[PDB]
Each structure stands twice: as structure tokens, then as C-alpha cells.
Design an enzyme around this catalytic site. Structure first.
Site, short mmCIF file in Angstrom:
data_model
loop_
_atom_site.label_atom_id
_atom_site.label_comp_id
_atom_site.label_asym_id
_atom_site.label_seq_id
_atom_site.Cartn_x
_atom_site.Cartn_y
_atom_site.Cartn_z
N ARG A 135 0.53 0.51 -11.78
CA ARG A 135 -0.46 1.34 -11.11
C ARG A 135 -0.90 2.51 -12.00
O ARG A 135 -0.29 2.82 -13.03
CB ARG A 135 0.08 1.87 -9.78
CG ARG A 135 0.88 3.15 -9.92
CD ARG A 135 1.25 3.69 -8.55
NE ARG A 135 0.11 4.25 -7.85
CZ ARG A 135 -0.24 5.53 -7.90
NH1 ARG A 135 0.49 6.38 -8.61
NH2 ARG A 135 -1.31 5.97 -7.23
N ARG A 182 9.75 10.43 -6.59
CA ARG A 182 9.01 9.27 -7.05
C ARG A 182 7.58 9.66 -7.44
O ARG A 182 7.03 10.65 -6.95
CB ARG A 182 8.97 8.20 -5.97
CG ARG A 182 10.33 7.85 -5.42
CD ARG A 182 10.91 6.77 -6.25
NE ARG A 182 9.82 5.94 -6.74
CZ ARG A 182 9.91 4.63 -6.94
NH1 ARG A 182 11.05 4.00 -6.69
NH2 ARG A 182 8.85 3.96 -7.38
N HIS A 233 0.83 -1.20 0.00
CA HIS A 233 0.00 0.00 0.00
C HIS A 233 0.87 1.26 0.00
O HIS A 233 1.87 1.32 0.72
CB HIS A 233 -0.92 0.01 1.23
CG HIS A 233 -2.24 0.68 1.01
ND1 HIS A 233 -2.37 2.04 0.81
CD2 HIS A 233 -3.50 0.18 1.00
CE1 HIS A 233 -3.64 2.35 0.67
NE2 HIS A 233 -4.35 1.24 0.78
N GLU A 272 9.61 3.82 -18.52
CA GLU A 272 8.92 4.87 -17.75
C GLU A 272 8.74 6.16 -18.57
O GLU A 272 7.63 6.48 -18.99
CB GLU A 272 9.67 5.14 -16.44
CG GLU A 272 9.71 3.97 -15.46
CD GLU A 272 10.00 4.40 -14.02
OE1 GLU A 272 9.53 5.49 -13.60
OE2 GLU A 272 10.71 3.65 -13.30
N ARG A 315 11.98 -6.29 -8.21
CA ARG A 315 12.14 -5.09 -9.03
C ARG A 315 13.37 -4.30 -8.58
O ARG A 315 13.62 -4.18 -7.38
CB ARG A 315 10.89 -4.19 -8.97
CG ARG A 315 10.96 -3.04 -9.92
CD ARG A 315 9.66 -2.28 -10.04
NE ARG A 315 9.44 -1.42 -8.88
CZ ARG A 315 8.87 -0.23 -8.95
NH1 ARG A 315 8.49 0.23 -10.13
NH2 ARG A 315 8.70 0.50 -7.86
N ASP A 332 3.89 6.67 -13.77
CA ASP A 332 5.25 7.16 -14.00
C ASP A 332 5.33 8.04 -15.26
O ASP A 332 5.77 9.20 -15.21
CB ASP A 332 6.24 5.99 -14.09
CG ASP A 332 6.18 5.03 -12.88
OD1 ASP A 332 6.80 5.31 -11.83
OD2 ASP A 332 5.52 3.98 -13.00
#
Ligand SMILES: [Cl-]
Ligand SMILES: [Cl-]
Lengths: 935, 944
Positions: free
Chosen positions: B628, B756, B168, B553, B443, B590
Site C-alpha cells: 500500500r 502501525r 479495507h 520495512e 502474512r 511503512d
């Protein structure tokens, strides 16, 4: 495939109308039967299926008109079967009957109670459809009888209902068949939910068929007549099924009912309103397979099962208990418990922080529970442990203490509502079930204690305790119990039996007290029988001795009992050991074997009266223990009135009752049925304490005294005086086959060479229940009612008054009427025609005449024109079982003719798609499961 | 004086005016829970505190109704005047109330009846659970497309839906608070059963209050910012909750629909229609708390959990399996197994007799499962065991064989109906969850592999692997994979990071293959990034290497990606090693952070198209992994259309999607929600395989290319070129606090580029402004409408007939529903310097402008005109979220500014102030800020 259409018509013809408007019983039976027959055809072929269907249809026609031609048609089809087909037909009808039982259970559990159907008097208490629930029982206590809520609450705290589970008289069915019956039950239930989507209904149907087949394809015999441990494993299934979750359910319902009459408190979580005692592994009366090691096994196994269930419960409890506010005391205990070495919850948290104190104490309790189970398993499988008994809970208070600390702390911080959630349920489970779930009773004959003492007195050069008068026995026993020197040592000649008795006492002494209930003296007759067991208990180093319970069986024993118990109270040692509590056992079925059922009933009412007079004289709290065979031993509704019927002040807040094996499935398999069982026992006990049944008019007692004299005269003249009776009994009945077969763990007689006297009561009842004749239950009632009617026609008006206003009499007559509903003289006559000598036939003819006369007289006493005129729901349920049970009867009778008589060659038919002993066993277990309880 | 209930009923009924059906009992549910909660609040903290909290809620609801700023001024006025104790209780109170609102939401959705008369007949029906196609309606394939049922059955057999559970972004709430939410949901549900007795209803009411209080009295802070193992333990709750029982339920439903279109077979019990992958314990990108030992830990834990569940399930199986007739092979196996020493069922049978052969084999399987759990627990707790590996199941086929023997044998004797009961459910669970429940992905950044190879080449005196061009790197890496000499030994200068990378590879090499899914390269840009990872896998003695998955990305990486993958397929060693399967990962969030949301969406559509072209040229089965932030990452209904929206032949029977943490409860907490989740994933996959979305008209493509150029220009001009943007961002937004508090890990890897993507989205979601999701859309649509009067009619054509465009716009519209510029302005007034005030003002204008433009594109006059049910639920959460916003903003002003003295009020009643003793800031201010963050987070759920 329009064969399903026929069975709907025959079913609807068997029970004509609807006994309500949620009466979906005939639908349920039709559905189960259709799916089952489709399964039979798919497993054993169209021919076998057509044969079985023709048999059921014929049976339905018979139960319709009782035309004997129908029976001869059944016989013709059944004899022409080689044992291969005979096994499949018999097996099939067994399962069909079981399905009928399942539908019965669903109908009962979801029938809507009709409040406008109550009449307002005690008769309402004889049926589940109109009995008082807990809250109606409260309002009755508070309204009619002017008892204050405070008094009701106080009475409740102090009340105990103790249900005693007994090993099944035959098949204590596999721990797995409960499960399969459950899945069939639940599928049936949801198929009729008024909220079901089409795909859900489809998948439910496929699950139903799948599980019917799953049950039909499991064997029902083989292996050992299961060891007492196995039968005990089977008996404890109901704790997993319903009782474990069901008890906190019911107790919370008591809490609510109390609030609705103004009581703000809950029943204290440590009050034993419910208890479970067991005989499985402890009754040795005429059963040598129950050894000391058997008892040690079922004890340790029980403690294992309990430890497992508490263990799995405490994890949900631990997730619940994540509060931080707590008591100073609890905070202390948490910081203390934090000082140690958390392996049994790595999947849940790495460890438990001291910011979650309840979780700390509870995780410790979880650990100790684990060590308790592991130690019990080690002693069971080995004999020693290595798990320190200090790392376990050994008595109930060690266990209750931390939980009660949590409850205190949570209440301190204003968090009582959380306390009354999972925590209160958990405390209620600890207090109800203890560390063993059940408490084992021990039972043994008095004669075996006589033997042990006779060897003791011979070895001490005092004479023979067997030759001594009862008073000499009493005196010696008293002197030794008053003394301080031990009685015997290892130097003692022990026969195998004597060693068995002494070793039983040693195992009782090597186990915790919380595992044991009562020591029960079969065939008790005199105070020296109780004193004997007390001494043997002491001189075998039993630290906390069990309470001794005499069981007065024969009639003369019952008359002599109140003098005996008074004499026992007048001796100082027994008075000081019992601590104001004394339990006595009565065996309705046993006394019945002695002197017929009517006399045993009236004598037990009177004897309980005199016992209560004595128990009041000397200030003891008397508790009557009701053995197998009573009115309070029935299934469901009737129990409620049977309890209310007992003589005033014989209950006194402490009811101990036997849940017969035949009734336990019907009473505890399903959430609703279990709730209503616990509810009616609790409510009826509570009411009977403050509203005793009416006292009988003197003319009633004089009348029953006469009828008792006549009835015992008839019963004894038939069963004991007739010289050719026992030959008839061995022919017209499968008594000998039952004795030799692998059905029950018990030998049928106490002396193989004796007559009816040495025959145990259970085989006596069974033998005549198989033939749908039930002679032990009704024989004697006929000549009693006849005799008083001829003396004066107006005595029938008196008997009818008694039936309408004296609860005791109503419940006696009602049980008889119910047993007649399970009777059919025609089938008994068929057994006669095949199995009984021709010169003995008039005997049977005469007895059946006695049957019909007694039935007519019983109907007249109850003011009925049909049997069970007042309980049409029960009438419907039984009439529906009748159709399968009858086929199992005809099959049984011809199988007996074939087994006993190798000179009976039959024109067999070709074997019917993909051995007489197995068929016979099947018919026996089947008819057994269909007739359930009688007397 | 308890007619406060009339007040909350009136405010609620004003918040949601009408009925969205007639089983619409939502406002009832919310009123009922709220009333019981407020009574509890009064009995624990006093009548005054309760009146304060209720007044705050009413003001908040009136605001969400008319949006009058006076209401905001009233809320602020009351909140500043509370000493930290009362601020803690107010904040906690509103968090818990929002949760109750979510529970009522779940119950309403689970029991809302689908309205068959409401389907419009086209694909739009697939964007709401109220009208979407169930498994069987997706019959549609047979009607419109004339596909034979046999072809559908074959398609379904080979289809795999792989759901990836990820840690989460903030609070994956304790396994303990979820449970209480469950008891509350069930109590609510049963109170509304139309057959419940008065005593039952009384006891249910008390059970509900009891569990509301029990949840209110658990702390929501303290202990450690939980170790990655703890977060993984929490993530696995949903397998116990619904998923374990749910998979066989769903698959059997598939069986039923197949029967309902004429197919007699069932779906084979070993076909992976459902799979669960996990990142908890394997994603180390910018997260140093994720060590090699963490990975070893969560691997072993997962295998423990799986063994426990199989163990407890197999006892119900053993009781069921009481048959005697069996296969000849099975009779043999039973007599064989009978030669041994029966300890784990003394409570059931003393031992198992050989007339129950199935029970014999199954009891043996139970023994082997027990030893598997014990050995895994030993390895986790020590490092060694003493449980022989021959007494456990180490790979899944050992486990499958005896069960399949039972199934075969049972079918032999005509006992298939028995076989298709508990036994089929068990086989299906074995095949779906395997010995680990989930498969861990790993990852890591590409730059972290580059460091390792650079230290290797420096140690061998060959140069610096960092300096080499992409083709020189490619060259060296190729020769080394062709070679036969190992590459390095213990004698190697290792930085701490390099030791972490190599040690992770060794741990992967020490664990069974069924534990691992894919190795994912963050910041992938060129084939040498993949080749590095394959080479490290071989030279660290990983026997069966993981499949390597590049995550492209940035936007330029996305344009360059299909060139990279073509070059990678064109390499003989790699072409033979992958074995015709390639998985590529896209990160909607991203790329959004790089180039605005619109440009990243269109660019991801095009790049997927070009990858499908390459995969057909070279004959590889491409599998796209949706990270995501996507359209396919939403909750419930919308997912169904998002999947259908994907470009043709990009799915091809293998769907891999991320289940974002903020959505997981809404998708898996409850039986029905779980079923419909699995169902819309399965049905959407199957349909899209046989019925691709329309191909876009060329004008639509050219138009979207233009709009992307403009949008990227605006977005980058604001975020990267405005020099005072970074100054504003640190004032108007709790980004610095989010990094500095206890949530997550490290936000920066410098400015916004090194920030991020998740903290970027979070910061602007807290202030109800959502700038990352919509910025750029305004100037794009403005540009194309001014270029030509008619382009709006084309966009409206697109929104009505091109699924991809409809779901992009729809996601935006939903995000705007959770937006409110007034609240953002309050953050400005309290936290932003005056000379920076117009900046925010201008930004807010763009918001409103973009809102109007989105509304016109979607042909709407109100937000979410098409999904009034969602509109209702959002409208209802907003009334709690707004109070949590005001509380947050004043708490920020108080925290940053010790010179802001306020006229405090007297403390209310009995304390929570003393659960954070080692705080560097004020007694209750730290906890108050955290509470508002977790709260607003749980209220806004998913955006972009
Ligand atoms: Cl750990
Ligand atoms: Cl045993």
C-alpha cells in the site's frame, strides 16, 4: 471478392423506395446475406456458394416481374442436384429466410412512430406505425367519449387479458435457436447504434458472423418428434426471454399513463391484468401422444420453472431490502421467524440479523421457494416426496402474504417509494404468473365423454346413453348431479380410451387448482355435452372443478349454440356452479373448414351477438375465447383493430386469445415487441369496453346474409361436391406427405378413410399454404362479391362503405388481402405441371382463375389498386420474404416429383463439397416459417 | 417555496467555475442528485431539518471557495447547538451526500471522451485518463522503438499482472450499499441518454429517488464489527459486479489491437495476463481475529463462489454449444460419457442426446462443478463430506481438459468462430480465476517465527534461538534443512501464539496449492527470517510450500536487504528450492512511517536497483510486490505513469500491486472503469518491459541523497525527538478514538514506533493535515536551494523529465489538494491545551512552506495545475468533507469532556438515536463520531 455488390442491387430492385427515413431494412438484409454467403463459401466451397447465389438472384428477378422462364431456370438448376447438394441448398435458403425475419424484427422494434401520419379514426389502429399507445388510448377515452379518469381506473383494475400459448402446428423451434436468433438480433441492433467506436463495431461484426455460423451448423431434425414435455420446455423459453421481466415493465407503464390523466393510485399489485394459459400438454383432441402422465409432467415442470425464477429474483430483492424502520406487525414476524434452525445464502451473509427484518422474512420466503422446487422435482422424477408440503407454498396466498406484509410495513414508515421498486415488481410477477407461470387448458372431443357415459349406463343396467335422445340425456344427467350417491367404482369395463378420459380427470384431481385453466369440449353441440364433463369431473373427486368451455365448430352448431347456452343457464345446478361467469370458444379456422371463411366470419359475429343477448338475460359475465384462425390472432398492429372490431359487450373486461405458434416469436422475442403486444391488447380491450364498434346498418346485415348463402354454396360445391376434388388435393399439395412425416404430433384425419370432412382444420390450412395458393382462406369470397355486384352495381358502393366504416368488415377484408399478398398462382401452376394428372389440369386452371377473380374483387372492395396499399411497411416486409420462399417452393415441388415417382431419373451434377425425405422436410419447415400465419 | 434549487445551483456553479471539456456535465449531476436527496430529507425528517442541512452545506461550499474562517465559525455555531439526535441525522445526511458526489464523479469519468488533440506527445500524457495510451496506442512501441509485432505478441503472452485485494482500513461498505450505489449510477447515466422518451425519463427519475431514499434508510453501523469472513464476502462483490464479465471483455479487446498491428493469432486462452490475489483471511500481522479457522473458511468460501459462477455460466455455454460435427477424439469422449445414470437441467432437456456431443461433455462438466460446490459447502459447514473427491475438480487441469477438447474439436471442423465465442470466454475465465477466484497470501511477523524456534531450541536443550547471532542462526537453520530428522512433536510447550503459528502451517498443509499465493514476512531484516519460514513449512508437512516473500520495512532494513537476498541466493538449498523465482515486498507507507516520505521513496528506488543487480548476477527472475501507499496505488490515470516510472528491469513481465481498499470502488464498480484499469496495468507493464525510463543523471542522484539526509533528519526530529509530540498527537487527532472504537484491529504492537502505519496515516488524514505524507519535503528543498541558487532549476528539470521524481512530487501535490490547515487549527482550538498551541502553529507553518516549495518544484502556481479534472472533482468533495470535519471536532470535544455543556436546540423531527443502546458514552455521540470517521474517510480516499 466483389460478389456482395450484386445482392445489394437485386435487393434494392425488389423493394424500390423507402417506407420511411429510418428504413434501414434493405441494408440489414444485405449485411446478413453477405456475411452468411461468406460463411457458406468458407464451409462448403466456392462452387456451392456460387450456385446458392445464382438461385437467390434468379428468385429475386422472379419476384420482380413474375416471368415463368425464371422458374424454369430455378428448376433446371435444382433437379441437377443429388440429394447431398439438395440438402445444403434447402438448408441454406431456410436460414436466409430466418435472417430476413430477424432484420424485420429489428426494423419494427426501432422504427420511429410518426405522429403526423395519424388520420384520427379507427383505421390508425391497424398498423404499429400509427396505433394508439396506452396514453393516447387514455386521452381518446377521456376526450371524445367523456369518460372520467375514475371510471378508466376502475375499468382497468377489473380487466384481464389472458394469452393462451399453443403447441406449434409444426416446428416449435429448439429452446437454443431462440438464443441464437437473439444474439444475431442484438448484434444487428448495436452495429447501427449512432454511438459505436471502431473496435466495438469490429468485435460486433465478428460476433455476428460467429453466431450466423453457429446457427447454420446445428441440426434441425432427428431424435423423436419431440415429446410433449420437450415441446413445452421450448414454449416456456419466452418467459426467460422477455415476459418475466416484461410484465412488471408494462404494468409500471400503466402506472405512469394513469398519473398523466390525474390518477394518483397504481394498478393494485394483485390485479390480474395479464394472464398466461397454455395448451402444451393439455390438448388431447385427436392427439393420443398427450397422456395423463404427459399432463402431470408439464404441470410439475411448470411449477419447477416458476419456483426457480422466483428464487433467483428474491436474492436481488433481499439485497435491496436492508431497511430497519418497520411495522409492529412486521417486527413481530421477524422476531418469530428468528426462532428456527440459512443454508442458501452463505455466500452473501453468515446469517441475517433481526436488525434487518425485511431480509429475515424474505430469506424465509427464499427457503420456502427452494423447498417448493425440490418437492416438484421429486414428484416429477419419482412419484412421492419427503419434502413436507407444509415447508412449501402450495397456494398463491401463502406466497403473497409475507410480501404484502413487507409492502404494508414499508408504507407505514413513509417508505412507499422503496416499496414501488423491486418489491412491487416482485408482487406483480407473483400475481401475474402464480406458482405455475401458465395455467393448462384441457381439451377433448364430446364423443369421448359419450363413450364413457355409455359404458357407465350400460354397467348400471339403465340403457345406452348414446341411444338416448338429447332430452333423456339432459334429464338423467340432471338427476345424478342433483343426487348425493356416487356413480361408479373400480368395477367398470374400461377401454383404453375410456381409461384415458377417467385417468385424465384423476390427474387433474391430484394436482393444485392453480395449475389448471379450463376444460374444453371439442365438437360441442348441446348442453348435455357440458353437463357430461361436469359430472365426470365431480364423480372423479375433483375438489375445485374447472370451468367448462364448449367449442362450437361447425356452422349448424354455431346457429344452435345460443339456444343451447340459454338452456344451460335455465338449469339451476349449472347456474349455481358457474358463479356468474361463462366462457364459450369459437374456432375461426374450424368453422372455416366447414363452410368457407366468409360465412364463418359473419356467422361468428352474429352468434356472438345472440350469445351476449342470452348472457344478459340470465346475468352471467360472458367471455369469448378466440381459437386459432381469427383476426385477433394476427401479428402486431392489425390485432389492435381486430379487437376493437368485435361485437359490443362480447369482451366485458375479459379477453382470452390464442397466440398462434407462428406469431409468438414475432410477438415476444424482443423487449420492444413484447411491450407493444401487451400494450395493444391491454389498451384495445379497455377502449372497446367504453366505445363499442358501430352497430351495422340493416342493409349491411341483409347483404352479408345473401353473400354468406352464395359463398357457402360455391365453397361446398367445389370442396365437397366435385367428385375428382380430393384426388386433385392429394396431387397438387403435400397433404399425404405431411400426414406421414415427423412434423406434427397429430394425425391429420380423425378417420383415415374419410374425405375432407374428417380432416382436421390445421392440415387443411397447411396443405394449401405450402403451395402459396391458400384456397381455404379466400374460396367463396369471389362468387359472393360477384353475385351482389351483378344483382346491382350499387352494392359495390355499399361494400366499400362497409370497408370504410364498419371495423368488423374492414378487418375481415384486410386479412384476406394480406393472405393474397402471400399468394402466387404461378407457383401453384408449377406444382400442377409436375405433380397433377394431365386430365386434372383444367381443374387447377379453373381454380386459379377463381383466385385471380377473387383477388380483383377484394382489391375493388378495399378501394385499392395494389394489395396492401394501406400498409406499405408490411408490403415491403413480405415482398422481401418472397424471394427465399419461392426457391423453397420450386425445390419442394421437384422433391415431391422425385419422391412420389421413382421413374423420374435426372441428370445429376457432381456432388458439391463437404436423402430426399430430409430435403422435403426442410422445404416444408422453411415455407412454413416464411408464410407464418394465414387462416 | 421550493426555490432552494436556485441556491444549490448557484453554490455548486461557484465551486467549479469552468468546463474541463464540453461533455463536462458534472455540476449538473451533483445538483440533480443533491436536490432529490434534500427533498427526501425534508419528507422524512421535516422542513426544519432540511433547511438546517442546506444552510450548513451552503456555508461549507462558500468556505471551500474563499477559505474565510468566519464560515468555519458559522458551521461550528450551528453544529454545537444540536442535541445528539439532530447531530446523528446531520452527520448521516452529509455522509450520504458525499457518496452521491462520488457516484456523479464515476459517471462523469466513465463517459468523458478522450481528446486526441490534447496529447502532448511525451510520457506526461500517461498521468491522466484523458490522454493516456490505450492498448493500441501503446503502436508507440513499433514507431519509436522499432519493435516487431511478433516481439510484442511474445512479450504479452508471458506478461502477468497480479492485483491483490486487501481488507479495507475502515469500512469496506456492505455488499448492500454498493448495490444501491450501482442502481443510482445507472439511473443517472440513462437519464442523460440522448434518445430517451418522456415516460422513460419519468420512470427513471422515480427509480433514482427511490434508490437514494433506499440507501439513506439503511443503517451504517450495528451488528458485529464484521468477522473476517464477512469482510471477505464484501471484498468479493467486485467479481460479481464487473470483473467476472470484464476479464474476457478486456482480453478480447487485446486480441483486436493485435489484429490491428498485423498479428493473426489471439492471446492464448491459458496465458495469465490477469490474476487476482487476496489478503482477506490471510494477513494476521497484529490481527488476532485472523485465526487458522478463518483461513480455512475464506479458502473454502472462495472455491464455493468460483464453482457457483462457473455453474451458472456453463448453462448459457451449453445452450450455445448445439453443434454436431466434431473431432474423432471428442466423439469418443461423448460416447464414453453416455455410459452413466441428467438432473440439473430437467427444465432445459429431459436428457442430452449423443448427437450433441459438446453438450454431453459440457453437461458432465456442469455435474462435476455442482458436486464441487456441494463438497466445499459441506467441508465448510461440517469438517467432513461424503462427496467423493473423484466426482469433483480438485486441480485446474482436470477442469481445463474437456473444455480444451471442445475447443480443439471445434477448430478441427473449421468451427473456430464458434470456438472463439462463449467457449473462449469460458476458457479465459477458467485460466484467470481458477477454482478459487483469488489466491490467499499469508502474512506474519518475523518475531512470531522467532518465538517458535526459540521454544523449539529451549525444548531440545540447545540454547535460545533468540540469543544466537544472525550467522549462528543461519548455521543451525542450514544444518536442519540439510538433515533428515523431523524437528518436533506433540510434546512441545506451546504458547497460545506459537500454537496459532503452527496451526496456520497445518491448515496451509491441509488445503490445495491453487488456494495460496505467497507467505509474507512482516519486519524482515536478515536471511534467517526467511530460512525460519521455509523450515517451519517443511517441518509442518506442507507438501508444496508457499514462496516466501520478505517485506523489508525500516530504512536500515532496506539498505541491508540486497545483502540479505544475495546471501540467500548464495545458499545451495534455497537456490535450488525457489526454482529461479524470487518476490520481494516493499511497503511505501511503512518505510514512510520510519524515515519520512521523501527518504523512503528515494531509498525504495535505489534498493530496487540493487536487487535487480543481484538477480542478474545469480540469474533469478525477480518480482517486486508493491504494498500500500505507493505511486502505483493511486486511482485511475496516475497509475499508468507510476508503473512506467519504476527503475529499469524491475518489472520484467510480472507486476504485483496492491489495490488499496479506499480505491477499489473507484477502479472496479463500473464497466468502463474496470476496463481502463485492466488496460492501463497491462499496457504499462508491456511498455516498461521494452522501454525503460531514462536513467538518472549523476547530479540528480547526489542531490536526492543529500535531500534524503536532511528530510529524514527533520522528520525524525519532529516525530521521535520532540517529547511533547506524542502528547499533541493524542489531542489534535482522533487516533485514540480510532483504536478504541470498532474499526480494524489493534493499532499498537509504546509510542509511534509500535503504532502501525495505517492508523498513523488515518489519524492525520481525518484532520485534513496529512503530516505523514509531506513532512520533511520542506526542509529538504529549502536546504538545497540555499546551498546553491541553481538547484531549483535542477529539481524542475527532474520534475519535467524524470518519471519517478515527477510522480513522487505529483502524489504529494494531490495530497496537499486534500489538505486545509484552517480545519486543523479548529481541531487545535477545541481539543489541544493552550501551552501546546504554538506546536501546532509551527507545524502548520511547515505545511504552508512545503506547499509553496512543492508548487515551485512542479513549476505550478496553483495545486494540480496540470490535472484540472481531478482538481474539479476534489474541490467538489471538499464541500461535504469540511462539514463532516467540524462535526467531528465538536463531537470530540463533547466526548472527551463531560464538562462542556452547550445550549442545545429543540429536537427536529422523527428514531436513529436508539440504534446503539449499549454505549458507554452519550446516546448519539458514539454513532455521530463513527459517522464522521467513515464519512471523512470516504471523502479523502487515498493519500500516502
Ligand atoms: Cl462463515
Ligand atoms: Cl420429462
Amino acid at each position: 471478392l466483389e460478389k456482395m455488390a450484386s445482392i445489394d442491387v437485386h435487393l434494392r430492385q425488389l423493394v424500390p423506395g423507402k417506407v420511411s427515413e429510418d428504413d434501414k431494412l434493405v441494408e440489414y438484409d444485405a449485411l446478413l446475406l453477405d456475411r452468411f454467403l461468406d460463411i457458406l463459401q468458407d464451409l462448403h466451397g466456392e462452387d456451392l456458394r456460387e450456385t446458392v447465389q445464382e438461385l437467390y438472384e434468379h428468385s429475386a428477378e422472379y419476384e420482380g416481374k413474375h416471368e415463368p422462364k425464371k422458374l424454369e431456370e430455378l428448376g433446371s438448376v435444382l433437379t441437377s442436384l443429388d440429394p447431398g447438394d439438395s440438402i445444403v441448398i434447402a438448408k441454406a435458403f431456410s436460414h436466409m429466410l430466418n435472417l430476413a425475419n430477424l432484420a424485420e424484427e429489428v426494423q419494427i422494434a426501432y422504427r420511429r412512430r410518426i405522429k403526423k401520419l395519424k388520420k384520427g379514426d379507427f383505421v390508425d389502429e391497424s398498423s404499429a406505425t400509427t396505433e394508439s399507445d396506452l396514453e393516447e388510448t387514455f386521452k381518446k377515452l377521456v376526450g371524445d367519449l367523456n369518460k372520467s379518469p375514475e371510471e378508466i381506473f376502475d375499468a382497468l383494475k377489473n380487466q384481464t387479458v389472458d394469452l393462451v400459448l399453443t403447441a406449434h402446428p409444426t416446428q416449435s423451434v429448439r429452446r437454443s435457436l431462440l438464443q441464437k436468433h437473439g444474439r444475431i438480433r442484438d448484434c444487428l441492433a448495436q452495429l447501427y447504434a449512432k454511438d459505436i467506436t471502431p473496435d466495438d463495431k469490429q468485435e460486433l461484426d465478428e460476433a455476428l458472423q460467429r453466431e450466423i455460423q453457429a446457427a447454420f451448423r446445428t441440426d434441425e431434425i432427428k431424435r423423436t418428434p419431440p415429446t410433449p414435455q420437450d415441446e413445452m420446455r421450448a414454449g416456456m423459453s419466452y418467459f426467460h426471454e422477455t415476459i418475466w421481466k416484461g410484465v412488471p415493465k408494462f404494468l409500471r407503464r400503466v402506472d405512469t399513463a394513469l398519473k398523466n390523466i390525474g390518477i394518483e393510485e397504481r394498478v393494485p399489485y394483485n390485479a390480474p391484468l395479464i394472464q398466461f394459459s397454455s395448451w402444451m400438454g393439455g390438448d388431447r383432441d385427436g392427439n393420443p401422444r398427450v397422456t395423463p402422465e404427459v399432463t402431470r409432467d408439464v404441470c410439475l415442470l411448470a411449477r419447477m420453472m416458476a419456483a426457480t425464477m422466483y428464487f433467483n429474483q428474491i436474492e436481488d430483492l433481499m439485497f435491496e431490502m436492508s431497511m430497519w424502520r418497520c411495522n409492529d406487525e412486521l417486527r413481530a414476524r421477524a422476531d418469530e421467524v428468528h426462532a428456527n434452525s440459512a443454508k442458501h445464502y452463505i455466500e452473501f451473509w453468515k446469517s441475517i440479523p433481526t436488525t434487518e427484518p425485511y431480509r429475515v422474512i424474505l430469506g424465509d420466503v427464499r427457503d420456502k421457494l427452494y423447498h417448493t422446487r425440490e418437492r416438484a422435482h421429486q414428484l416429477l422424477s419419482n412419484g412421492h416426496s419427503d419434502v413436507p408440503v407444509e415447508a412449501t407454498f402450495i397456494n398463491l396466498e401463502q406466497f403473497l402474504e409475507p410480501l404484502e406484509l413487507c409492502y404494508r410495513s414499508l408504507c407505514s414508515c413513509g417508505d412507499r417509494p422503496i416499496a414501488d421498486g423491486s418489491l412491487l415488481d416482485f408482487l406483480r410477477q407473483v400475481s401475474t404468473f402464480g406458482l405455475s407461470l401458465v395455467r393448462l387448458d384441457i381439451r377433448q372431443e364430446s364423443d369421448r365423454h359419450t363413450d364413457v357415459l355409455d359404458a357407465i349406463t350400460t354397467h348400471l343396467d339403465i340403457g345406452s346413453y348414446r341411444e338416448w335422445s338429447e332430452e333423456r340425456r339432459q334429464e338423467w344427467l340432471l338427476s345424478e348431479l342433483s343426487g348425493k350417491r356416487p356413480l361408479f367404482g373400480s368395477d367398470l369395463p374400461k377401454t383404453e380410451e375410456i381409461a384415458d378420459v377417467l385417468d385424465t380427470f384423476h390427474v387433474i384431481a391430484e394436482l393444485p387448482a392453480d395449475s389448471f385453466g379450463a376444460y374444453i369440449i371439442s365438437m360441442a353441440t348441446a348442453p348435455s355435452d357440458v353437463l357430461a364433463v361436469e359430472l365426470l369431473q365431480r364423480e372423479c373427486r375433483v375438489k375445485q372443478p374447472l370451468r367448462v368451455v364448449p367449442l362450437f365448430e361447425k356452422l349448424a352448431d354455431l346457429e344452435a349454440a345460443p339456444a343451447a347456452v340459454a338452456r344451460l343457464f335455465s338449469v339451476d345446478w349449472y347456474k349455481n356452479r358457474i358463479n356468474g361467469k361463462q366462457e364459450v370458444m369459437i374456432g375461426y379456422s374450424d368453422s372455416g373448414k366447414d363452410a368457407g371463411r366468409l360465412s364463418a366470419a359473419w356467422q361468428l359475429y352474429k352468434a356472438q351477438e345472440e350469445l351476449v343477448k342470452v348472457a344478459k338475460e340470465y346475468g352471467v359475465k360472458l367471455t369469448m375465447f378466440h381459437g386459432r384462425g381469427g383476426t385477433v390472432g394476427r401479428g402486431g398492429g392489425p390485432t389492435h383493430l381486430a379487437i376493437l372490431s368485435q361485437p359490443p359487450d362480447t369482451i366485458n373486461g375479459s379477453l382470452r386469445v390464442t397466440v398462434q405458434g407462428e406469431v409468438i416469436e414475432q410477438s415476444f422475442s424482443e423487449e420492444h415487441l413484447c411491450f407493444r403486444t401487451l400494450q395493444r391488447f391491454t389498451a384495445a380491450t379497455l377502449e372497446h369496453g367504453m366505445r363499442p364498434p358501430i352497430s351495422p346498418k340493416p342493409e349491411w346485415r341483409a347483404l352479408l346474409d345473401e353473400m354468406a348463402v352464395v359463398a357457402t354454396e360455391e365453397y361446398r360445391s367445389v370442396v365437397f361436391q366435385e367428385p375428382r376434388f380430393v384426388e386433385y388435393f392429394r396431387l397438387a399439395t403435400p397433404e399425404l406427405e405431411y400426414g406421414r412425416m415427423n412434423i406434427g404430433s397429430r394425425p391429420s384425419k380423425r378417420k383415415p378413410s374419410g374425405g375432407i370432412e374428417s380432416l382436421r382444420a390445421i392440415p387443411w390450412i397447411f396443405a394449401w399454404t405450402q403451395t402459396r395458393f391458400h384456397l381455404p382462406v379466400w374460396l367463396g369470397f369471389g362468387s359472393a362479391i360477384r353475385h351482389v355486384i351483378e344483382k346491382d352495381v350499387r352494392n359495390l358502393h355499399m361494400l366499400q362503405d362497409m370497408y370504410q366504416h364498419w371495423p368488423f368488415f374492414r378487418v375481415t377484408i384486410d386479412l384476406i388481402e394480406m393472405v393474397f399478398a402471400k399468394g402466387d398462382p404461378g407457383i401453384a401452376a408449377l406444382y400442377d405441371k409436375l405433380l397433377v394428372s394431365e386430365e386434372l389440369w383444367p381443374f387447377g386452371e379453373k381454380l386459379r382463375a377463381n383466385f385471380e377473380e377473387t383477388k380483383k374483387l377484394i382489391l375493388q372492395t378495399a378501394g385499392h389498386k395494389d394489395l396492401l396499399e394501406g400498409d406499405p411497411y408490411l408490403k415491403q416486409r413480405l415482398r422481401l420474404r418472397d424471394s427465399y420462399i419461392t426457391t423453397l417452393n420450386v425445390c419442394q415441388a421437384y422433391t415431391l416429383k422425385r419422391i412420389r415417382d421413382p421413374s423420374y431419373h435426372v441428370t445429376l451434377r457432381p456432388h458439391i463439397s463437404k436423402g430426399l425425405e430430409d430435403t422435403l422436410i426442410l422445404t416444408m419447415k422453411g415455407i412454413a416459417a416464411g408464410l407464418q400465419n394465414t387462416g
